[PDB]
Design a protein around this nucleic acid. Structure first.
Ligand SMILES: Nc1ncnc2c1ncn2[C@@H]1O[C@H](COP(=O)(O)OP(=O)(O)OP(O)(O)=S)[C@@H](O)[C@H]1O
Ligand SMILES: Nc1ncnc2c1ncn2[C@@H]1O[C@H](COP(=O)(O)OP(=O)(O)OP(O)(O)=S)[C@@H](O)[C@H]1O
Ligand SMILES: Nc1ncnc2c1ncn2[C@@H]1O[C@H](COP(=O)(O)OP(=O)(O)OP(O)(O)=S)[C@@H](O)[C@H]1O
Ligand SMILES: [Mg+2]
Ligand SMILES: [Mg+2]
Ligand SMILES: [Mg+2]
Lengths: 327, 282, 319, 439
DNA sequence: GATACGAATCTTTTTTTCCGTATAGCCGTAGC
DNA sequence: GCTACGGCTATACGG
DNA sequence: GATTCGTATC
């Protein structure tokens, strides 16, 4: 019943060739498998980069039918304390293989949430029973892992998804769901994805839901911005132009009108203005400092909440004061 | 402050069994117990002050001799004693007759912290072996005794169920019904059911349900009555039901549960009351 | 089929002569092995520089045939509670095993830094009771985790970080044993990425050979990444804010490094940053701490890191 | 074949590395404790590891026990690893004490508790407390002398939780014994100090000349003096010094001499942060080593309070108010970082930089003190009890719900004044709650 | 006799795991 | 031959 | 680490 599933858990890759983006890691692990030697892998990267899918497809490729007993997967949902590591992991990586020979695979999903004592006990299991067992460690934060564990694990870095991988996955989704996507909407979707496939899948599902009749109807950038509630680039450019050139009253009026036209959030406008101003050429190096600092505290205050109009006026005043240094 | 009493188990069986059951119950409930020696009755109290309270009344005619004298009102001598020492003394005295004897158990208050000189005899087979014991107790003050009172029970929604006597045909079946919920290891709350006669033991949880029901004949002495209580108190209720023929169950809607046990000595009747608060709300 | 031991364990040294690095310490271990009178010792240092293998080789050359029932290797993977220490260590120490006149039983306690304090006191009692028949060897990362009374009876040996020359020698031995193609630039890149870790060097070399074959700088830097502490140090030491921002973005944000990792690395680098003033160092520490608090509270965007870099540059160039 | 610290153990009192005053006031206490009616019941010895605490008691028992023993020599040491079949673990020490209580007349033997039972488990720690409390309060007409030696060591961090207790941080007599045991009339405490350089040098020289042939064979005899001085300078542990000397002598190469590193005390760390450390002019290196070696003490709110309390003792308070304002502002800023390591690092670095910039020769500093925050907490607890009493009497004789906020603001001073005139001119509470406010 | 050295003082009340005890359940043997 | 009770053991709790 | 008082040694 794959039609009764969210799009994120509907297009999970089943084979290694279905994982896009991380070509180097996929080729390296495939060479490892074909050569017959697999070290203690360690997968590191931002969420949604395809670490769990890659390791699951790798385990399926290695053990086609014996995946149930040749693979032991533990994650943050199960207790992974000192006792679990001492007993269950040792018992799994202490017995002989059933009939598949090869080696036993132990996957530690989100190992950054494990305690330090658990990792200290796990390092000796890893370096002791490595003849017949290989460990895989998946984590988004490397600072929460013991340096010895990183030392005994071969580190693989999962980069954020490039453009072409997003295009290929979106094309596959469109072919499967019989959907149409405008190139402008395609560009908008990749920009908001931020190297995340789950965000792309969720936004595509929401856009298909947004259409009154899914077939014979294209998904435009307007549909994307209406479904996800993000400001259009034209709105951001107009707001920045009004703040930079116009006086205070009309800039405030323009910001209020732009925000009230579609119900836009101030934090999204702040992120858009930050992204646009990064492309600007500033010749003072004090405008950069003022902009970054003032916008950082404004974003933090928005994260803690407060008066929204005061925060918007603060954004306008901060930008104006920072650009007064460029004289 | 002159307290002295003599107990003969073989002379009067029923009241000695009542005393032994009270001692066992107060020992199983919690450590230490309150012995209130009023001039006409002895009350054994186990006050944890949610957890239940046991209020057993023992008449003065139970013991062969009941000299109780103190400067307080109605010669009220109140004392706190460890149940384990008293339980061990009572087990020794019970084994004394079990091996064959009829000797009396003499108890005197020999000296605020005092001790009872519980001494009795035993004869193996025509030898004299004197068993002497001294259980350290503390003497509760008069105001501290006044701070302990039996909790009154409202009768606005309280409904009585006359549980069948265990000596009858339905007594063993009802005992099995009561202990049917005790064989589950992972049970902490029992939610009772009475609609207006049926007694239903319902244990509802996240992923399992239990519907023990009593289909036998029952009497209510003379409307839904639900109260959820802990399993440990239900064990005490089951233990009390086995040792008492006249057992009365009172259920209050979302307020409390009362387990009344009575021993018809007729003569003043010995009664045991176990007040149980609801563990949580319906 | 898949049967091939990883090069980390396939080439684990079995004798003290194959251990590179601390030449003086290895020579002392050889002298102890040839003498026999091994005292209580504590071995500490960075991970993967040859602490566990040195102790195992010393025990093997000190007992030989009696290694099967003359050593007791307990680690963090095994239970090491006060009851376990009591029972097992007392029974092993009391055991009367006949040995050469200069030979003693060895109790190898790997990962001794993760042992409970009550077990440490039990170890004190066992050492004071049975020091004439058995000896205790401690392997740890830092000696501070072992209590002072335990360290009082032990001869502390400190393992320094492996030099580039010793790592190169062991690596070249492995190339000559495996007969794989290599380039001097590739070996230099492997050493540079290893950062004094021998196990990391072996893992990176094995991955490079198994993924690309010939070991050059291009393949190595295409499979493994440059150490992010060095990238963070370069970012913090930039002159102007634009270069630091560009380095931060294109080397930590486009590469897929978490912001909390960047903040922790910046804190460590600032703690170990030379050629800077104390006031500047403490101001950057305070700024990194404020950024760390903001990241922990939930605001983990690139804007916070950019603001941290801007404030660091503002304090660097003053006002 | 044997360890040097074991084969060269003292045979008499003259070979024990101990100060003359320490030997004298331990001898006097032990001799007084062997009297038929001894004022002191037990003897408590505290100090760092390898401070001749255990051995001096043995050599004293070799000369005191045979003298006071009746007619019809060593200590009766508790052994914790003994596992008896019918003995629960918490009852082992109780059984040991009950058995050792029968050592008074014609069976006299000193009792030496060198290794205590497992005190890191709370139940047996409380059992130990109430077991040694009963010994001091025992109604026994005469008891054998009891000697307890506790090694003052810092327990390293093992598990991550903010329910860390006193025993979890450091292993000292204060964390083990409570206030009742320590402040007892029948308890005598003799704290110990690390062995000085002079005794260490003398004993290392004696050990060296006891093995003269082996150092002369390895040509290390000419270099033995500098090794002895350097070892005595580095550490104060006699066992560690002898072990290091044996390791150096048995060596055949140029291996550098290393010894165990002693932890830095609380007031030692306070002085290091305030006045700096000699032989280390780099503040960054000193702070980094202090944080790496003593992170347990540094990562505590007690240390920041100690700095705030003792930063005015740099020159008896004779420094610019700008420096004090900067220090207290930095401490207030660090208090808002929720205990991050960066907060402690920044605070210590700023304090050290501030005190380094104004440092001058000839400065006469003051004496540092522990923070008084615990006294303030105790006074607040007393105020809470008195306010609870006031609210109880005000809610029992009549119906009046007043908030504790109003009790502290106005009712803590106005209401006692009302009850004063009302009573003298003619309710229960007449004095100001928490006492009067002075200055 | 001047000085280096040494002693005394400057002090305290959520989460995971582990160590030992409590307790209920079940099996084996004495007695009715 | 059957039941009761004491001893042994596995599991939850507590600090 | 700092201050203050008391000894042993040069
Ligand atoms: N490279 C990829 N190719 C195709 N689909 C992908 C890729 N990366 C992610 N996805 C999709 O995103 C979903 C979630 O990715 P996962 O790999 O399960 O999670 P993850 O990448 O490990 O991130 P974290 O760190 O575990 S939250 C997958 O089920 C796929 O549908
Ligand atoms: N000096 C060395 N010479 C040769 N191989 C070495 C050396 N040091 C480490 N290795 C290799 O490192 C691997 C095992 O190193 P270990 O000694 O177990 O690590 P470690 O030094 O004990 O650090 P930790 O704290 O235990 S993670 C094996 O593959 C060894 O060949
Ligand atoms: N001259 C000496 N003076 C003192 N101890 C000596 C001497 N020569 C050898 N030793 C040994 O040095 C060791 C010192 O141990 P102690 O200090 O007596 O024990 P301790 O005080 O309890 O230290 P901890 O806390 O148990 S590690 C003993 O094993 C002595 O035998
Ligand atoms: Mg995942
Ligand atoms: Mg190791
Ligand atoms: Mg000792």
């Amino acid at each position: 019943s794959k039609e009764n599933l969210p799009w994120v858990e509907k297009y999970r890759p089943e084979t290694l060739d279905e994982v896009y983006g991380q070509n180097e890691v996929i080729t390296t692990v495939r060479k490892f498998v074909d050569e017959g030697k697999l070290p203690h892998l360690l997968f590191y990267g931002p969420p949604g980069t395809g670490k769990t899918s890659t390791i699951v497809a790798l385990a399926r490729e290695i053990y086609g039918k014996n995946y149930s007993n040749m693979v032991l997967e533990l994650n943050a949902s199960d207790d992974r304390g000192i006792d679990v590591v001492r007993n269950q992991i040792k018992d799994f990586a202490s017995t002989r293989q059933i009939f598949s020979k090869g080696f036993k695979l132990i996957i530690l999903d989100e190992a950054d949430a494990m305690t330090n004592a658990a990792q200290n006990a796990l390092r000796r299991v890893i370096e002791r029973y490595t003849k017949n067992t290989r460990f895989c460690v998946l984590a988004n934060y490397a600072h929460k892992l013991t340096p010895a564990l990183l030392s005994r694990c071969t580190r693989f870095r999962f980069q954020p998804l490039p453009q072409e991988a997003i295009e290929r996955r979106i094309a596959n989704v469109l072919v499967h769901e019989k959907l149409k996507l405008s190139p402008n909407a395609e560009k908008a979707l990749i920009e908001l994805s931020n190297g995340d496939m789950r965000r792309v899948l969720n936004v595509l599902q929401s856009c298909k839901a947004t259409l009154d009749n899914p077939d014979e109807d294209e998904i435009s950038d307007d549909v994307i911005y209406e479904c996800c509630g993000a400001p259009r680039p034209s709105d951001l450019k107009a707001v920045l132009k009004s703040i930079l050139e116009d006086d205070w009253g009309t800039a405030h009026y323009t910001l209020n009108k732009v925000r009230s036209a579609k119900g836009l959030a101030l934090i999204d406008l702040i992120e858009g203005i930050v992204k646009i101003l990064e492309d600007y050429e500033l010749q003072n190096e004090e405008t950069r400092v003022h902009l970054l600092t003032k916008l950082a505290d404004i974003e933090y205050s928005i994260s803690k909440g407060g008066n929204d109009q005061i925060q918007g006026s603060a954004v306008i005043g901060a930008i104006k004061a920072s650009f007064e240094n460029e004289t | 402050m002159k307290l002295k009493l003599i107990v003969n188990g073989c002379e009067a069986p029923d009241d000695y069994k009542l005393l032994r059951t009270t001692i066992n119950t107060v020992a199983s409930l919690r450590k230490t117990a309150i012995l209130r020696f009023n001039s006409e009755r002895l009350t054994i109290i186990s006050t944890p002050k949610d957890t239940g309270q046991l209020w057993c009344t023992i008449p003065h005619d139970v013991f062969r001799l009941y000299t109780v004298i103190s400067a307080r009102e109605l010669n009220t001598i109140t004392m706190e004693c460890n149940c384990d020492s008293l339980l061990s003394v009572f087990k020794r005295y019970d084994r004394v007759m079990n091996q064959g004897s009829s000797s009396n158990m003499t108890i005197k208050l020999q000296s605020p912290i005092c001790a009872l000189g519980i001494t009795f005899e035993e004869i193996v087979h025509n030898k004299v072996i004197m068993h002497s014991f001294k259980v350290p107790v503390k003497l509760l003050f008069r105001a501290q005794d006044t701070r302990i009172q039996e909790p009154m029970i409202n009768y606005i929604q309280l409904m009585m169920y006359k549980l069948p006597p265990i000596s009858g045909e339905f007594g063993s079946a009802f005992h099995g019904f009561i202990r049917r919920v005790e064989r589950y290891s992972n049970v902490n709350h029992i939610h009772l059911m009475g609609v207006k006669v049926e007694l239903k033991i319902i244990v509802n949880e996240l992923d399992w349900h239990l519907e023990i029901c009593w289909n036998g004949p029952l009497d209510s002495v003379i409307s839904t009555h639900e109260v959820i209580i802990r399993c440990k108190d239900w064990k005490v209720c089951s233990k009390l039901y086995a040792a008492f023929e006249e057992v009365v169950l009172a259920i209050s809607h979302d307020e409390s549960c009362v387990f009344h046990c009575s021993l018809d000595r007729g003569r003043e009747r010995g009664q045991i009351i176990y007040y149980i608060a609801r563990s949580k709300g319906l | 089929l898949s049967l091939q031991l990883p090069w980390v364990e396939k080439y684990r040294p079995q004798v003290l002569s194959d251990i590179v690095g601390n030449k003086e310490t290895i020579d002392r271990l050889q002298q102890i092995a040839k003498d026999g009178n091994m005292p209580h010792m504590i071995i500490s240092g960075m991970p993967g520089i040859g602490k566990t293998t040195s102790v195992h080789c010393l025990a093997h050359e000190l007992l030989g045939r009696s290694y099967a029932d003359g050593v007791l290797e307990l680690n963090a993977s095994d239970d090491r509670g006060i009851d376990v220490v009591r029972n097992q260590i007392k029974h092993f120490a009391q055991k009367k095993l006949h040995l050469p006149p200069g030979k003693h039983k060895i109790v190898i306690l790997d990962e001794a830094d993760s042992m409970t304090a009550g077990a440490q006191q039990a170890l004190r009692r066992t050492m004071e009771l049975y020091s004439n028949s058995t000896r205790f060897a401690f392997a740890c990362n830092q000696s501070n985790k072992i209590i002072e009374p335990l360290q009082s009876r032990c001869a502390i040996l400190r393992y320094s970080k492996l030099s580039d020359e010793d790592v190169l020698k062991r690596l070249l031995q492995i190339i000559k044993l495996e007969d794989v193609k290599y380039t001097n630039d590739g070996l230099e890149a492997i050493i540079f990425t290893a950062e004094g870790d021998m196990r990391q060097a072996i893992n990176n070399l094995q991955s490079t050979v198994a993924g690309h074959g010939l070991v050059n700088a291009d393949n190595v830097f295409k499979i493994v990444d440059s150490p992010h502490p060095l990238i963070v140090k370069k970012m913090l030491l930039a002159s102007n804010l634009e270069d630091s921002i560009q380095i931060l973005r294109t080397d930590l944000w486009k590469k897929g490094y978490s912001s909390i990792d960047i903040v922790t690395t910046s804190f460590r680098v600032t703690k170990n940053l030379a050629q800077v003033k104390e006031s500047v160092r403490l101001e950057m520490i305070k700024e990194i701490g404020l950024t760390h608090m903001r990241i922990l509270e939930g605001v983990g965007t690139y804007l916070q890191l950019a603001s941290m870099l801007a404030k660091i540059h503002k304090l660097n160039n003053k006002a | 074949g044997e360890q040097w610290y074991e084969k060269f153990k003292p045979n008499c009192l003259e070979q024990v590395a101990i100060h003359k005053r320490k030997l004298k006031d331990v001898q006097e206490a032990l001799d007084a404790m062997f009297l038929p009616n001894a004022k002191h019941r037990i003897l408590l010895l505290s100090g760092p590891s390898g401070c001749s605490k255990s051995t001096v008691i043995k050599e004293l028992s070799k000369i005191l026990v045979p003298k006071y023993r009746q007619n019809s020599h060593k200590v009766t040491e508790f052994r914790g690893d003994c596992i008896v079949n019918d003995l629960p673990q918490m009852e082992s020490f109780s059984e040991f004490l009950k058995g050792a209580r029968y050592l008074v007349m014609s069976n006299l033997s000193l009792i030496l508790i060198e290794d205590l039972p497992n005190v890191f488990h709370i139940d047996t720690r409380r059992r130990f407390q109430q077991l040694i409390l009963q010994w001091l309060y025992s109604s026994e007409p005469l008891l054998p002398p009891l000697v307890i030696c506790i090694t003052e060591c810092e327990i390293p961090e093992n598990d991550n939780n903010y329910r860390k207790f006193g025993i979890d941080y450091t292993f000292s007599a204060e964390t083990i014994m409570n206030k009742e045991i320590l402040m007892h009339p029948r308890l005598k405490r003799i704290k110990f100090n690390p062995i000085n350089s002079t005794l260490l040098k003398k004993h290392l020289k004696f050990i060296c000349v006891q093995n003269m042939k082996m150092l002369k064979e390895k040509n290390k005899w000419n270099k033995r003096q500098e090794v002895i001085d350097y070892i005595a300078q580095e550490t104060g542990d006699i066992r560690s010094a002898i072990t290091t000397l044996q390791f150096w002598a048995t060596s055949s190469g140029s291996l550098p001499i290393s010894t165990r590193e002693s932890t830095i005390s609380y007031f030692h760390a306070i002085g290091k942060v305030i006045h700096g450390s000699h032989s280390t002019n780099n503040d960054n290196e000193m702070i980094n080593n202090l944080f790496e070696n003593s992170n347990n003490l540094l990562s505590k709110e007690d240390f920041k309070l100690g700095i705030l309390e003792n930063y005015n003792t740099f020159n008896k308070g004779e420094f610019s108010i700008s420096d004090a304002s900067s220090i207290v502002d930095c401490l207030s800023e660090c208090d808002n970082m929720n205990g991050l390591p960066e907060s402690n690092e920044y605070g210590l670095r700023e304090v050290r930089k501030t005190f380094r910039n104004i440092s001058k020769q000839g400065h006469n500093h003051g004496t540092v003190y522990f923070p008084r925050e615990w006294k303030v907490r105790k006074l607040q607890n007393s105020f809470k009890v008195q306010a609870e009493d006031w609210l109880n009497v005000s809610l029992y004789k009549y119906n009046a719900v007043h908030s504790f906020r109003n009790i502290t603001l106005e009712f803590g001073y106005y209401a006692p004044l009302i009850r004063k005139c009302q009573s003298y001119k003619k309710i229960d509470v007449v004095d100001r709650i928490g006492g009067p406010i002075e200055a």
